[PDB]
Structure 1
Amino acid sequence: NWLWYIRIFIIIVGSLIGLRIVFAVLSLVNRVRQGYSPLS
Protein backbone atom coordinates (compact mmCIF):
# COMPACT_ATOMS: atom_id res chain seq x y z
CA ASN A 1 0.00 0.00 0.00
CA TRP A 2 0.97 3.80 -0.14
CA LEU A 3 1.67 3.52 3.71
CA TRP A 4 5.38 2.56 2.81
CA TYR A 5 6.01 5.82 0.78
CA ILE A 6 4.48 7.68 3.83
CA ARG A 7 6.69 5.53 6.39
CA ILE A 8 10.24 6.24 4.83
CA PHE A 9 9.26 9.98 4.77
CA ILE A 10 9.25 10.02 8.69
CA ILE A 11 12.95 8.63 8.69
CA ILE A 12 13.95 11.91 6.69
CA VAL A 13 12.13 14.06 9.49
CA GLY A 14 14.10 11.79 12.02
CA SER A 15 17.53 13.09 10.63
CA LEU A 16 16.55 16.85 11.32
CA ILE A 17 16.14 16.34 15.23
CA GLY A 18 19.72 14.81 16.01
CA LEU A 19 21.30 17.81 14.01
CA ARG A 20 19.82 20.43 16.55
CA ILE A 21 22.45 19.40 19.35
CA VAL A 22 25.00 21.96 17.70
CA PHE A 23 22.56 24.88 18.89
CA ALA A 24 24.19 24.36 22.41
CA VAL A 25 27.73 24.74 20.84
CA LEU A 26 26.39 27.74 18.66
CA SER A 27 26.06 29.93 21.91
CA LEU A 28 29.94 30.03 22.54
CA VAL A 29 30.44 30.73 18.68
CA ASN A 30 27.72 33.51 18.94
CA ARG A 31 30.14 35.25 21.52
CA VAL A 32 32.02 36.70 18.46
CA ARG A 33 28.59 37.51 16.69
CA GLN A 34 27.36 38.96 20.10
CA GLY A 35 30.82 40.68 20.77
CA TYR A 36 28.91 43.76 19.32
CA SER A 37 25.98 45.69 21.11
CA PRO A 38 22.25 45.44 19.81
CA LEU A 39 21.93 47.26 16.38
CA SER A 40 25.80 47.95 16.35
Structure 2
Amino acid sequence: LLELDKWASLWNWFDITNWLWYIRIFIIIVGSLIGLRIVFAVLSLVNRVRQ
Protein backbone atom coordinates (compact mmCIF):
# COMPACT_ATOMS: atom_id res chain seq x y z
CA LEU A 1 0.00 0.00 0.00
CA LEU A 2 1.86 3.24 1.31
CA GLU A 3 5.75 2.93 0.66
CA LEU A 4 8.73 5.27 -0.39
CA ASP A 5 8.07 4.15 -4.04
CA LYS A 6 4.21 4.78 -3.76
CA TRP A 7 4.58 8.45 -2.43
CA ALA A 8 7.47 9.42 -4.91
CA SER A 9 5.10 8.50 -7.90
CA LEU A 10 2.75 11.58 -7.19
CA TRP A 11 5.81 14.06 -7.64
CA ASN A 12 5.63 13.32 -11.49
CA TRP A 13 1.82 14.37 -11.47
CA PHE A 14 2.95 17.70 -9.69
CA ASP A 15 -0.58 19.49 -9.66
CA ILE A 16 -2.44 17.05 -7.17
CA THR A 17 0.66 16.76 -4.78
CA ASN A 18 0.60 20.64 -4.24
CA TRP A 19 -3.19 20.51 -3.27
CA LEU A 20 -2.72 17.40 -0.83
CA TRP A 21 0.43 19.26 0.75
CA TYR A 22 -1.18 22.81 1.46
CA ILE A 23 -4.76 21.80 2.78
CA ARG A 24 -3.33 21.91 6.47
CA ILE A 25 -2.27 25.67 6.13
CA PHE A 26 -5.65 26.38 4.36
CA ILE A 27 -7.90 25.30 7.43
CA ILE A 28 -6.10 27.96 9.72
CA ILE A 29 -7.13 30.78 7.13
CA VAL A 30 -10.86 29.48 7.15
CA GLY A 31 -10.65 30.00 11.04
CA SER A 32 -9.99 33.86 10.80
CA LEU A 33 -13.02 34.09 8.32
CA ILE A 34 -15.80 33.75 11.11
CA GLY A 35 -13.97 36.43 13.30
CA LEU A 36 -14.07 38.90 10.27
CA ARG A 37 -18.01 38.57 9.97
CA ILE A 38 -18.62 40.08 13.58
CA VAL A 39 -17.91 43.82 12.40
CA PHE A 40 -21.22 43.61 10.25
CA ALA A 41 -23.10 43.90 13.67
CA VAL A 42 -21.82 47.67 13.87
CA LEU A 43 -22.87 48.15 10.08
CA SER A 44 -26.57 47.34 11.20
CA LEU A 45 -26.49 50.66 13.29
CA VAL A 46 -25.14 52.53 10.12
CA ASN A 47 -27.99 50.78 8.05
CA ARG A 48 -30.65 52.72 10.21
CA VAL A 49 -29.17 56.12 8.88
CA ARG A 50 -29.48 54.84 5.16
CA GLN A 51 -32.05 57.17 3.26
Same structural fold, with TM-score higher than 0.5 when normalized by the shorter chain: yes
How many residues are paired up? 34
Partner deviation per Cα, 1:13-36 (whole Å, 9 max, x = no partner): 1111101111211110111225xx
Could you tell me which runs of 5 or more consecutive residues in structure 1 were left unpaired when the two chains were aligned: 35-40
Separation in 1, partners of 2:19, 2:47? 44
Q: Using the aligned pairs only, state the percent identity.
A: 100
Task: Show structure 1 runs of 4+ deviating over 4 A.
Answer: 1-4
Higher relative contact order (CA 8 A, sep 6+): 2
Structure 1 pair 5–31 and aligned structure 2 pair: CA distance change class (3 A): same
Structure possessing the higher radius of gyration over alpha carbons: 2
Unaligned residue ranges in structure 2 (runs of 5+): 1-17
Q: TM-score, normalised to structure 1's length?
A: 0.59
